[PDB]
Design a protein around this nucleic acid. Structure first.
Ligand SMILES: Cc1cn([C@H]2C[C@H](O)[C@@H](COP(=O)(O)NP(=O)(O)OP(=O)(O)O)O2)c(=O)[nH]c1=O
Ligand SMILES: [Mn+2]
Ligand SMILES: [Mn+2]
Ligand code: NA
Ligand code: NA
Length: 326
DNA sequence: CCGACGTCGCATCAGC
DNA sequence: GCTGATGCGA
DNA sequence: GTCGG
């Protein structure tokens, strides 16, 4: 964090554009800029120096010069003072509440945590659970707790069917010392790109984790993706652990490497890699890498038998999970 | 100058 | 009910 | 907001 002040500024600007202006490409522009500055191994001395980096243009360069000279940004100082922007930004911190619902709530005079708590009937299920655990979801997860959680998940999954493979991805697989949540990739030989020989594969696992009181709430749930809440068990007279967000994704077993590449992240890393893939004439999702034809249409899936194969196709040197934290 | 910006799952809604 | 778009999220 | 062509 040689340039923590700058990256903080840009992230706050990113959040404004996403939540208030509802301009998603500005949000990504700022986040991309923040990321490239974050890994820049010098303390930045000027906006001109920063503009040399890919993703930093004229406007951000000027903001960096203002921030360097004064320690502040007048544009952000004004935004911070605005009631509507501040209220909208706050409401979006609740899981299930996005830019649209936040602005609608503020219109209806619901703009504080207290306002939300007395208008619970106006929330959908996701938002209601998000409000319930607002405090808990603010807290990060120490890696040591992540290891406890991994142990439970992998063992409970094993008990259902010993041919399941569960892999913890996201920031954990990238070796982070603390995570925002837990991300679990799931495979079973019955579910491939060719066929589904077994129903309720994800359901079976979710059910087991509920039975042992690990999973406590559900935000969303379908055939391949689960979004919910979990909690570590605590001992006698111990204060309870905070409730944690958990994401589970069932991927066709023969498409594990594309799946694990996707869910390992980071989000910005995926954006950068897939953009580069397009430049190289391929498209990548969580299932396949495919060539783009002359007319621009995706062709048939290419052979993949390691994460590295995917890097090879787009002419990138392989990068370990710990080097993908962009 | 300006088109494009990664890709997709689940909840919810409009229109039929 | 289905189809397609919108919102929020991974 | 940025940038490749
Ligand atoms: C949010 C997001 C996530 N992903 C993939 C890559 C992420 O690393 C992976 C898990 O999402 P996450 O749990 O929201 N983020 P994280 O695990 O990287 O970091 P954190 O510690 O959970 O905050 O899902 C995307 O591909 N695009 C996205 O926009
Ligand atoms: Mn995560
Ligand atoms: Mn997650
Ligand atoms: Na630049
Ligand atoms: Na939210």
């Amino acid at each position: 964090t040689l340039n923590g002040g700058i990256t903080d500024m840009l992230t706050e600007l990113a959040n404004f554009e996403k939540n208030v202006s509802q301009a998603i490409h500005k949000y990504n522009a700022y986040r991309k800029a923040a990321s490239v500055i974050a890994k820049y191994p010098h303390k930045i001395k000027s906006g001109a120096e920063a503009k040399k980096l890919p993703g930093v243009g004229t406007k951000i360069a000027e903001k960096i010069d203002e921030f360097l000279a004064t320690g502040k940004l007048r544009k952000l100082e004004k935004i911070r003072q605005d009631d509507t922007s501040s209220s909208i930004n706050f409401l979006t911190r609740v899981s299930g509440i996005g830019p649209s619902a936040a602005r609608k709530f503020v219109d209806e005079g619901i703009k504080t945590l207290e306002d939300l708590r007395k208008n619970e009937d106006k929330l959908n299920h996701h938002q209601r659970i998000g409000l319930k655990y607002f405090g808990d979801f603010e807290k990060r997860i120490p890696r040591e707790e992540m290891l406890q959680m991994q142990d439970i998940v992998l063992n409970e999954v094993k008990k259902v069917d010993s041919e399941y493979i569960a892999t913890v991805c996201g920031s954990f697989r990238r070796g982070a010392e603390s995570s925002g949540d837990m991300d679990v990739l799931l495979t079973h030989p019955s579910f491939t790109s060719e066929s589904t020989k077994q129903p309720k594969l994800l359901h079976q696992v979710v059910e087991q984790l509920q039975k042992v009181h690990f999973i406590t709430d559900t935000l969303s749930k379908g055939e391949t993706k689960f979004m919910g809440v979990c909690q570590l068990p605590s001992k006698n007279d111990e204060k309870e652990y905070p409730h944690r967000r958990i994401d589970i994704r069932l991927i066709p077993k023969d498409q594990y490497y594309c799946g694990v590449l996707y869910f390992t992240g980071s989000d910005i890393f995926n954006k950068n890699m897939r953009a580069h893939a397009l430049e190289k004439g391929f498209t990548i999702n969580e299932y396949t890498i495919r060539p783009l034809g002359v007319t621009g249409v995706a062709g048939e899936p290419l052979p993949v038998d390691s994460e590295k194969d995917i890097f090879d196709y787009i002419q990138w040197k392989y990068r370990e999970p710990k080097d993908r934290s962009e």
